[PDB]
Design goal:
heterodimer, A: mainly alpha, elongated, B: alpha+beta, Transferase(Phosphotransferase), domain 1, Phosphorylase Kinase, domain 1, 2 domains, two-stranded antiparallel sheet, 33% helix, binds phosphoaminophosphonic acid-adenylate ester, binds magnesium ion, transferase/transferase inhibitor, protein kinase, peptidic inhibitor
């Protein structure tokens, strides 16, 4: 499921803004 | 509404033209605990000595700001935040700087990030997501009317107050601009295609971001996700969006109009502006005035036991806030 794929991903925690 | 926005602009312009400066100092607060960290600053719960009130102090290391090329952005952030006034925007109570850091002291929103509740619960039902979405729509109508683009909408930047209402924080990428701008900034999952494509963009990017936010709130995951930002950008540009089976037909229709790659078709950026959104079937049950007036019963009220309680926030490793005896980047931050 899409939910399962998201949960197993590396981006489920707080996301910080883009910084160059 | 047009009557209200006109007066609002007068108030904003006065503060934009003559910004508040040096309204407090470090030793007037007792630093308690870190509430959150980002790519740029650290926000700590603090207690103001003379009043006894708690606040959320955003601390920015001047050298880090310079290193990350956020000088102009940080000046934008503070100049804009001190000039705005809206029910769903966090209030800047004080601001000041010292040899090493820049400080922005906001009202402490104890309910925690929408992010934490969203991840814990899994997802928000449609009426629940709608309640929050309405507040963002009104806030963007307000900001946009002042020629301001927000540029960082995401659950991590949205706080839930004691009454269950939204308080938008983090004006790090906020900018006052008439026309288009080009900075590649924001958070990966929320970037509109035009930002990624480096073609120049306008306030319409906030409306795209709203689409991403509504989708994430209702689904429990973003419309475009992957392990690395580059993969996310590929997905965003492709434009293909899939909706959970539980999404109502009305919600899907609204989302197809917000997550619209075509600027001539994206809701919020058309002839009727924000009205295409307010009048959309998904918001039919929304009493816009009642929302603005905070008269609607919140779908969720965070638990809070007394002032100073940080139970609605994750714990972070504490770090010493150093202050050199030599002033750093004085000229750069003169207006702060
Ligand atoms: N007024 C407030 N009350 C309570 N918590 C807050 C407040 N303002 C910010 N926070 C918390 O502090 C975190 C960081 O604040 P923020 O202004 O977003 O720093 P930032 O470095 O600009 N983050 P980002 O750019 O998105 O990577 C937020 O995500 C919240 O968890
Ligand atoms: Mg943030
Ligand atoms: Mg930020």
């Amino acid at each position: 499921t899409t939910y399962a794929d998201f949960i197993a991903s590396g981006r489920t925690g707080r996301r910080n803004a883009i910084h160059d | 509404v047009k009557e209200f926005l006109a007066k609002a602009k007068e108030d904003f312009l006065k503060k934009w033209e003559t910004p508040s400066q040096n309204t407090a100092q470090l030793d007037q607060f007792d630093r308690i605990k870190t509430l959150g960290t980002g790519s740029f600053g650290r926000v700590m719960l603090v207690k103001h000595k003379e009043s006894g009130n708690h606040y959320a102090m955003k601390i920015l290391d001047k050298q880090k700001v310079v290193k990350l090329k956020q000088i102009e952005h940080t000046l934008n952030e503070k100049r804009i935040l001190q000039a705005v006034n809206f029910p769903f925007l966090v209030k800047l109570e004080f601001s000041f700087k010292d040899n090493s850091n820049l400080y922005m002291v906001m009202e402490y929103v104890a309910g925690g990030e929408m992010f934490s509740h969203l991840r814990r619960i899994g997802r928000f039902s449609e009426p629940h997501a709608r309640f929050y979405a309405a507040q963002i729509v009104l806030t963007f109508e307000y900001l946009h009317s002042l020629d301001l683009i927000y540029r960082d909408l995401k659950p991590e930047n949205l706080l839930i107050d004691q009454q269950g209402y939204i308080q938008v924080t983090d004006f790090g990428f906020a900018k006052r601009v008439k026309g288009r701008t080009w900075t590649l900034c924001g958070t990966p999952e929320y970037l509109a295609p035009e930002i990624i494509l480096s073609k120049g963009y306008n306030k319409a990017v906030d409306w795209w971001a709203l689409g991403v936010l509504i989708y994430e709130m209702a689904a429990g995951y973003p419309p475009f996700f992957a392990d690395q930002p580059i993969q996310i950008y590929e997905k965003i540009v492709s434009g293909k969006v899939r909706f959970p089976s539980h999404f109502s037909s009305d919600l899907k229709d609204l989302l197809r109009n917000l997550l619209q790659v075509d600027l001539t078709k994206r809701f919020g950026n058309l002839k009727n502006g924000v009205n295409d959104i307010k009048n959309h079937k998904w918001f039919a049950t929304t009493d816009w005035i009642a929302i603005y007036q905070r008269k609607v019963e919140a779908p969720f009220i965070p638990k809070f036991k007394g002032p100073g309680d940080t139970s609605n926030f994750d714990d972070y490793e504490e770090e010493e806030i150093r202050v050199s005896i030599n002033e750093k980047c004085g000229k750069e931050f003169t207006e702060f």
